[PDB]
Amino acid sequence: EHSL
Amino acid sequence: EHSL
Amino acid sequence: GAMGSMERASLIQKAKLAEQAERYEDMAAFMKGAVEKGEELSCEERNLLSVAYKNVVGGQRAAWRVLSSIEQKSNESEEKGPEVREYREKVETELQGVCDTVLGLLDSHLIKEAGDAESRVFYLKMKGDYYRYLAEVATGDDKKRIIDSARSAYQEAMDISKKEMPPTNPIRLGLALNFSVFHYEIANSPEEAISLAKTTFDEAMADLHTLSEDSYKDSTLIMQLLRDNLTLWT
Amino acid sequence: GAMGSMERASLIQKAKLAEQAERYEDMAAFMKGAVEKGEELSCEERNLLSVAYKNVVGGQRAAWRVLSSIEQKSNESEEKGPEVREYREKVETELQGVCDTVLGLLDSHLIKEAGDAESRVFYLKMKGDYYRYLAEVATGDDKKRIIDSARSAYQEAMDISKKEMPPTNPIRLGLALNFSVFHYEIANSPEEAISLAKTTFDEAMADLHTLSEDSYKDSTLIMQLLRDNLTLWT
Ligand SMILES: [Cl-]
Ligand SMILES: [Cl-]
Ligand SMILES: [Mg+2]
Ligand SMILES: [Mg+2]
Ligand SMILES: [Mg+2]
Ligand SMILES: [Mg+2]
Ligand SMILES: [Mg+2]
Ligand SMILES: [Mg+2]
Ligand SMILES: [Mg+2]
Ligand SMILES: [Mg+2]
């Protein structure tokens, strides 16, 4: 995933 | 640990 | 609540121990107990709440993706019975339960009591994130309303952050990062995702000169995440 | 049991799905349900049972070690209250509960129905392992009896394995590996641990010429573990  |  | 008899300070202490032990379900239960004492959360306590539930839901999301992929392949194939769907549904329901728990804590009553920008933007951002996790597993006619709820929370957080925080503020940067992911992965708006990530990156770059070494490290770490996504998307 | 209404074959299928999803608590619950159907377990099913509970108790053991270390440092120091001890005790009790569950499955009635060497030695060896995990957290006057129970299970498994299996049999090799760890880490008998690991290694080496490529790979993998421990201990 590419979130924080 | 050193077990199986 | 099962934590109702434990001191707030003891719940916070045990959440920190649970983090060290990588016992994130315990950590989340301790932090839920602390929230339910009714007092506002400090900055450190907000981060403990977020770390706990992020790890719990992160494991559920990873498992749901594995099972959804197996289920989709099984519908391309030998009929293996209802078991794949049943078990994917079990994990999905548990995931939805955790998201509902987090959303309930934010609604009772973390957001309403949060008056400072750092707390209000943090909470929402969390509200946007957990509606986004609900959206990942939702299907039509419920998915639309869940998506709008995520969008609304992120938009309110953005509006506050742009008025009240510098463009290098790590909370503001992480909110923009996650709202851009929402646009790309949930809302079918890759151009909005790219525009948001680029404008956020560029405006932070121009403000780095104001920062100490430690703040510079904090901000550039999240800017690198924005850059990483722009590299993947463009 | 909560799995009493699910088909045995469905429980096994879902245990395999849970493994793929890294949902080991689910995997263990599914395999417990399968054991409680009352039928013997196949080789593949025994391995699913072992993988499930090994992962569950392995996480508990890792957490217990983190908390025990923090607790020991806290007694070298500022009084931080009862919380470290309380939480270490909570994890310890949960760990003991999982070990008791596994031991109960072996006693009701996996071992008594296990007549073939491969099944009986497998079960135990498991009985020795889970008494060994109980021993890791036990203190005096209970620790002695738990240690003897582990030793007794391992010794019966050894006696059968030496009579009924070739010295390269992977079950026999893994039993010897773990009994040697028992001697070194639990029973304060490092010389017995080293002797056992060395004799096991050497007798397997002399039997490798009888094996196919695939069996050779299976046996040498465990021999490398014996060698790794001998390197650390000598
Ligand atoms: Cl299920
Ligand atoms: Cl506790
Ligand atoms: Mg109080
Ligand atoms: Mg559903
Ligand atoms: Mg375009
Ligand atoms: Mg723009
Ligand atoms: Mg049946
Ligand atoms: Mg105890
Ligand atoms: Mg000696
Ligand atoms: Mg010897």
Author numbering:
A (entry chain B), B (entry chain B): 301 to 304
C (entry chain A), D (entry chain A): -4 to 71, 74 to 231
Report text from the authors:
The 14-3-3σ protein, which has multiple interacting partners with specific peptidic motifs, was used as a case study. We have observed this phenomenon first-hand with human 14-3-3σ, a protein which has several hundred known interacting partners in the cell. Furthermore, different isoforms of the 14-3-3 protein are function-specific. For example, the 14-3-3σ isoform (but not other isoforms) specifically targets p53 and is associated with tumour suppression, making it invaluable to determine crystal structures of the target peptide with the correct isoform.
To address this problem, we present a combined co-crystallization and peptide-soaking approach to obtain crystals for any 14-3-3σ–peptide complex that may exhibit difficulties when crystallizing under our optimized ‘sigma’ conditions. The second step involves, after these 14-3-3σ–cJun-pS227 crystals are fully grown, displacement of the c-Jun peptide via addition of the desired peptide for the final structure at high concentration to the crystal drop and incubation for a period of time until full occupancy of the peptide is achieved. We have found useful criteria to be using the peptide at >95% purity and performing the soaking at 277 K with an incubation time of one week. To demonstrate the experimental reliability of the method, we considered this approach for peptides found in the PDB where co-crystal structures were published with isoforms of 14-3-3 other than the sigma isoform, since they were not able to crystallize under the standard ‘sigma’ conditions or any of the other hundreds of screening conditions tested. Not only does this significantly reduce the production time, but new 14-3-3–peptide structures that were previously not accessible with the 14-3-3σ isoform, despite screening hundreds of other different conditions, were now also able to be resolved. The new strategy that we present here has allowed the determination of several new structures of 14-3-3σ which had not previously been possible, illustrating the ease and success of the method. All models were determined to belong to the orthorhombic space group C2221 using Zanuda. In addition, the method retains the robust, stable, high-resolution and well diffracting features of crystals originally grown in the sigma screen.
